[PDB]
Design a protein around this ligand. Structure first.
Ligand SMILES: O=C(O)CNC(=O)C(=O)O
Ligand SMILES: [Mg+2]
Ligand code: NI
Ligand SMILES: [Zn+2]
Length: 331
């Protein structure tokens, strides 16, 4: 078995290997990359996403989210308070202000220490989940707006044509902006490109051990767990590496820098935080290997998780027994 310790693997494809996206994902899996739940892909030196980032300041962040924490430093939830619209140029200035800017630090490990010590005492503002793309239309390789769609994959594998669309999302971050522990909708893959700015630190649980994280989360968030049998779908719970280690949960960590891709694999729980002002682009995708994960994915039906239009067909076709209850949660 390749990668039996489930380590995060880093890949350096050549420009020739960067042509065929599906083929490269399958290659990474042949080497055991998926066992970690997360892989890094460093693009060939010849590649670029676009020519420059000098002209992005007028993008609008219609609903910036203030991420307010509750709990203890290593075990907390966050809720999202909606703020007034602002441009990316305005958001960048805010991220760099004295109230929000990254503190002085020695290295990524010192900054990680500071994040886990102090995150709960601040409420950073995240420009998350903005439909759009920063890839140039002429970028032919690993262009996250030009990937094969999940609807087409399901149709190719299973023969059923379905409604729905699959487009990317932009994320504008600042120091301490946080992504809570989650797997993707329908335990899909994700791919994330860090276009510009400061790093993003990731934590990940191997897919084969995801239920260990779920059991800890039920223990640590006992009211939330009574409320919903899949409450991590709400994307609000944080647990620190120190707490994971104390509870024997297998995990790994890695820091993504500008110009790098990360892929999350089906049922790979992940969480993390941004180091400072940055911009990422991410999208879900599928492969043949996903279908079995999609069929088994948990679902939130309590009403909290509320998701895209396109998840309807995935549930309807892959999980017909669950469909009626899940759809009630949507309505
Ligand atoms: O970058 C973020 O805030 C969160 N991203 C992801 O969870 C992802 O790409 O799957
Ligand atoms: Mg602009
Ligand atoms: Ni994710
Ligand atoms: Zn729920």
């Amino acid at each position: 078995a390749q990668n039996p310790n489930c380590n995060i693997m880093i890949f350096h494809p050549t420009k020739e290997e960067f042509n065929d996206f599906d083929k490269y994902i399958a290659y990474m899996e042949s080497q055991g990359a998926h066992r970690a739940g997360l892989a890094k892909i460093i693009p060939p030196k010849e590649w670029k996403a676009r020519e420059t980032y000098d002209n992005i300041s007028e993008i609008l962040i219609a609903t910036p989210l203030q991420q307010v924490a509750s709990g203890r430093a290593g075990v907390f939830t966050q809720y999202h308070k909606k703020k007034k619209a602002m441009t990316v140029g305005e958001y960048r200035h805010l991220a760099n202000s004295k109230k929000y800017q990254t503190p002085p630090h020695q290295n990524f490990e010192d900054l990680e220490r500071k994040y886990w010590k102090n995150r709960i005492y601040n409420s950073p503002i995240y420009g998350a989940d903005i439909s759009g793309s920063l890839f140039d239309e002429n970028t032919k390789q690993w262009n996250l707006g030009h990937l094969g769609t999940i609807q087409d994959l399901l149709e190719k594998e299973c023969g059923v044509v379905i409604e729905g669309v699959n487009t990317p999302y932009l994320y504008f971050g600042m120091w301490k902006t946080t992504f809570a522990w989650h797997t993707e909708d329908m335990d899909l893959y994700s791919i994330n490109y860090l276009h510009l700015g400061e790093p993003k630190t990731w934590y990940v649980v191997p897919p084969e051990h995801g239920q260990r994280l779920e059991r800890l989360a039920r223990e640590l968030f006992p009211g939330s767990s009574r409320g919903c049998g899949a409450f991590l779908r709400h994307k609000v719970a944080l647990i620190s590496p120190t707490v994971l280690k104390e509870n024997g949960i297998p995990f790994n960590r890695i820091t993504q820098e500008a110009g790098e891709f990360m892929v999350t694999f089906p049922y790979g729980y992940h969480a993390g935080f941004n180091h400072g002002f940055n911009c990422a682009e991410a999208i879900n995708f599928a492969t043949p290997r996903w279908i079995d994960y999609g069929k088994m994915a948990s679902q939130c039906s309590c009403g909290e998780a509320r998701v895209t239009f396109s998840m309807d067909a995935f549930v309807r076709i892959l999980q017909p027994e669950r469909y009626d209850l899940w759809k009630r949660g949507q309505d």
